[PDB]
Design a protein around this nucleic acid. Sequence first.
RNA 1: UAACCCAAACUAAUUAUCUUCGGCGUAAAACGUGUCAACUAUAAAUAAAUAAAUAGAAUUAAAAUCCAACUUAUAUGUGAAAAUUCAUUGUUAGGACCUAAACUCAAUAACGAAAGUAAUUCUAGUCAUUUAUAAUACACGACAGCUAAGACCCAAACUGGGAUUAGAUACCCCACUAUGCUUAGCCAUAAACCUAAAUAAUUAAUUAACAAAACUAUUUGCCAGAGAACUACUAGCCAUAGCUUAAAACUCAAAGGAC
RNA 2: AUAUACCGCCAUCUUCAGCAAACCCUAAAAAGGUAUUAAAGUAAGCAAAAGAAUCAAACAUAAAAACGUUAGGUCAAGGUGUAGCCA
Lengths: 325, 208, 117, 80, 132
Amino acid sequence: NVQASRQESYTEDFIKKQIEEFNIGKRHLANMMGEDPETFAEEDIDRAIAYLFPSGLFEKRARPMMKHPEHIFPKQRATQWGEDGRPFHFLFYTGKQSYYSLMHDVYGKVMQLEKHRAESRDLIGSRWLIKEELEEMLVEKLSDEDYAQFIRLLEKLLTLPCGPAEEEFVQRFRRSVTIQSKKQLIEPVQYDEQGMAFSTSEGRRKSATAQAVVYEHGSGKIHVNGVDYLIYFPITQDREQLMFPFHFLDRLERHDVTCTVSGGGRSAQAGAIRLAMARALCSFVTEDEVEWMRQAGLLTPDPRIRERKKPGQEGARRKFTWKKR
Amino acid sequence: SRYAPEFREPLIDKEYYRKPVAELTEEEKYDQELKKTQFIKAAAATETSSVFADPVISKFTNMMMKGGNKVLARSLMAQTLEAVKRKQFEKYRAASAEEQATIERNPYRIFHEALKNCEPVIGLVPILKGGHFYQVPVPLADRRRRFLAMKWMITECRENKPRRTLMPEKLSHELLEAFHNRGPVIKRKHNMHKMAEANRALAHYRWW
Amino acid sequence: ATPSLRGRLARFANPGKPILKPNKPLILANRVGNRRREKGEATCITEMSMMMACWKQNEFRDEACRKEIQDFFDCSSRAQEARKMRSIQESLGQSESLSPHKMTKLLQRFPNKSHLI
Amino acid sequence: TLNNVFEPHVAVRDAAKMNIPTVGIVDTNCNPCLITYPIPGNDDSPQAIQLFCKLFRTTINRAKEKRRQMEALHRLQSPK
Amino acid sequence: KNRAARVRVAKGNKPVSYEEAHAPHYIAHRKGWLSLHTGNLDGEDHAAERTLEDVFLRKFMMGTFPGCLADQIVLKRRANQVDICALVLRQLPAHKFYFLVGYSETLLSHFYKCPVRLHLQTVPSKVVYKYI
RNA sequence: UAACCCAAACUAAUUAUCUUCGGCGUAAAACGUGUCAACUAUAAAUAAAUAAAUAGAAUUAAAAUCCAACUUAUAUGUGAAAAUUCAUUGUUAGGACCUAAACUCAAUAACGAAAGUAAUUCUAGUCAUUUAUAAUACACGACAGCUAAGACCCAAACUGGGAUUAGAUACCCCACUAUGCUUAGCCAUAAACCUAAAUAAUUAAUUAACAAAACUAUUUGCCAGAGAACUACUAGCCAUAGCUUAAAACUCAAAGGAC
RNA sequence: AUAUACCGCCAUCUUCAGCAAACCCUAAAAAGGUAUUAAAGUAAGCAAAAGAAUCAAACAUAAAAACGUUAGGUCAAGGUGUAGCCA
Ligand SMILES: [K+]
Ligand SMILES: [Mg+2]
Ligand SMILES: [Mg+2]
Ligand SMILES: [Mg+2]
Ligand SMILES: [Mg+2]
Ligand SMILES: [Mg+2]
Ligand SMILES: [Mg+2]
Ligand SMILES: [Mg+2]
Ligand SMILES: [Mg+2]
Ligand SMILES: [Mg+2]
Ligand SMILES: [Mg+2]
Ligand SMILES: [Mg+2]
Ligand SMILES: [Mg+2]
Ligand SMILES: [Mg+2]
Ligand SMILES: [Mg+2]
Ligand SMILES: [Mg+2]
Ligand SMILES: [Mg+2]
Ligand SMILES: [Mg+2]
Ligand SMILES: [Mg+2]
Ligand SMILES: [Mg+2]
Ligand SMILES: [Mg+2]
Ligand SMILES: [Mg+2]
């Protein structure tokens, strides 16, 4: 009692026709947009379709697309046996011919290294490919236990003496980790009409936003919104928050800052200025100092913001009293 | 929390970053190199490199704050320290040269040593034996021992004071009377120890 | 030497009355039981008594028992690290022997068969 | 013919269900009843397994080669 | 449990169209809006009157093309022009569609006092997004 | 209303016609145990010498009890208390008693028909019928109970007191008797069940389930839906509120076993 | 009138991890079907996940949450089966 549409597997003639219709589609889309068909590219196509079929759906998989059939149609796994019915691969009846064909090779490599008989960190900052990536290479689905065993076997290969052939092999399964540059983006150093050097940077705390303009040479005169900092910030804790950047680098009384903070309350405005001053002062400090600031919290934006209230609740987390029973 | 678990608590010690590289233990040296590849939480609004910032007093202030009124709680603590400094200067000036030596006029040193005196070492705890709860003397941890001293101070002053007295005048008179080990909060410590003495019989019930 | 199991159970071979009346069949299982949890003993119980003993004489005044109070902290400070160090290392290692889970998996690699193959 | 829990390999019973003949090496602790062509012999020693693997490989290659020669001779006769 | 506009699971034999498959929380994410007018934009008036016209226009087309609608109609208002885009099954003869187009256009242009046009795309049969 | 069956018949009531080669670990059922007959079968000429069978006499190590000396002020009891006790309590290399019961060995598996039997020593003592098969006969038969006279450390139905509970004719605490012991006699019942009668085989031509694999032959006993019913009546018996023997009316369409 | 005939729209378990379809295996199966140094399980759908939203980033919060359970709530949102009133 199974009555649902079967997988519409795509034959080579089907995909072949889908590529002829796509090739004729490009020539028409080029003629519509007034461009030259010879140079028309995938990038131009995506731009043309977005103009001619404006869609504002948030998920971009659901938007109109005129892509090459290879990109949209999943690669059909080829037939694994011929006309006589004899499987093409000797491990066909295992059910994971490609996973076991790979595990057969790595186990044979290990045996020759062990029979035949330096630092093993030939590659650094690399990771083993994740299960999803391995599955794609093998063009089949694996279990978590299948992945765990494959890695253990590959590690044993690295432990043993490895000729350049092995190093190239294990390389295929090592993905270069794109370690992000967790380092400050130093601001430029502009010059004023007077000719003095100064840097600018923005800062945001809660709903407050600030734009500081630190000067390379000064006596410690901080002006917030054209007012002094003792006047603008009558609270000591707010002034201490402005002191933190300079006091940390022992640069008190050596710079003149001009701030413009709009939004938020007294505490949120002092915090926004602190970040704005810390980011502007980066251009006038050594790179070792910039790392000292980043590692002391002076260069990180605070992500803590007020949480929306919930319907059916007194507050963001506060609940209504569970009535007595 | 809006900070992913990979974020690191900030280190706001000014000298630490400026120390010569050789002066740092390799364990400390290791963390610095590791932190270059990690995320760092932004420093709190009350976290500064100021030389006058004391964590113990900053914590004591937050335990007095009501409804997020940090200005008032900080103001009350400032008035207390001043009320203690002014009370010792009066005694110092009105004392002989011999007595003057002993008198302590540092309010920060009167505050810390006053709290440490109030700290209770062992307090009764409910422990389960044979599916039944018994009150067995237990060694109190550092955090619980410190919390109890501060809580007992902020509670004697808040409640057991005349109506027209103010917290800077009751707290100052209590920190000073707990700097000489002769106060109500010290008596509360002596009760916790007195009760544990009576229940020493059940001490072995502890399994750690 | 395992006790004798010949002429114990009630069977058509055994002429006399049975000796053993097992609640369950006497066939080795392929698992081991989960070892029931074990708890420790009080640490620094003697040092706590010494501290408390001095208080009783000196009206629970910490001025007299300053030295004893420092011994109580010393024992607790050592035990504090000892419980931390032993849980992190010894428990994780399981070097001395197998656990019930590890033992059962080995007993299942060479399982006992009370039936013909 | 045994799995790693010292029980008959599942494919012995399942190959009989599908009526597939089975050539199996049976040792003194195995059950040859369902093996079509049992070969009594040692299954644990590396020298015994290597001998059996060689025999089955030489035998299979000879049979495949003979088929090619048989086809060429008979095929050649058709024009000739 | 939420029961709003959700075509529930059966035993894999219920054909559902793209519109039916997606629950309300996919509106503006995977599926768009069937009616497009300017009356729900900020600082715009006559939302109530555009919404009432839509309810009627949908009930009118269902009765005027009974059993001939493959999917819900799409209403497009530009200036005072109304445009009705309906997927219709190829059940009726061709000439009958010309009659119903002339009739339904003239009748709805004299009822709402606007130019109304009917756009019909004929499908051989209902298009099935998935079997649920 | 229509259909279906039978048809000079048709339906109802009543009565009659069908009757043991099946079973007995858990569904009904192997008798508490052994021995002697006559049949029916069977066919070999052995046994015994066995560690706790049985009976009698003597004996005793530990722990109690009693008396005595010294002696805390309490001792005892519970999950927590009360009640009880100071004529107690603890120690005694002090005295008396010889009541009762037999640690370790025993992780042993022996003896005996079964019931049952294991502290030591000595006396008496188990043994040959080919084998299975016996009552209306003979002899035995745990525990509890009865009769007469003794014993009495400890235990303990009943009873009294304390507690618990809504109540507590109980479960827990204390005291104490019948009784457990000995000498005779009686009673003859057990989940007397290893729920599996005894004997001689056999292990392939063999899974209802579960339990302790299946199964043949021989001989006796027993069983034939459940409840009524370890009941009523009858006869026997040292048994008198008893034991063995053991129905029917009436009720139900199930009960029961294993999963 | 009946939520104990229902649609519609929800509550609860619940941010629980399952549900149902087609098969395959068992000295028969009322049902059951896992062991990774692998022992009878398999391959698709729904849910979870992913993705999208809070207009960089993450995290968080929202949203989402199958089959069922409570004859759960609502004939008074509207509609509607059956029964009832129609000076
Ligand atoms: K029994
Ligand atoms: Mg609130
Ligand atoms: Mg049993
Ligand atoms: Mg072998
Ligand atoms: Mg029976
Ligand atoms: Mg005495
Ligand atoms: Mg004595
Ligand atoms: Mg003799
Ligand atoms: Mg009573
Ligand atoms: Mg008596
Ligand atoms: Mg008697
Ligand atoms: Mg009887
Ligand atoms: Mg018995
Ligand atoms: Mg009876
Ligand atoms: Mg009777
Ligand atoms: Mg009678
Ligand atoms: Mg309901
Ligand atoms: Mg909820
Ligand atoms: Mg997102
Ligand atoms: Mg989700
Ligand atoms: Mg209801
Ligand atoms: Mg209701």
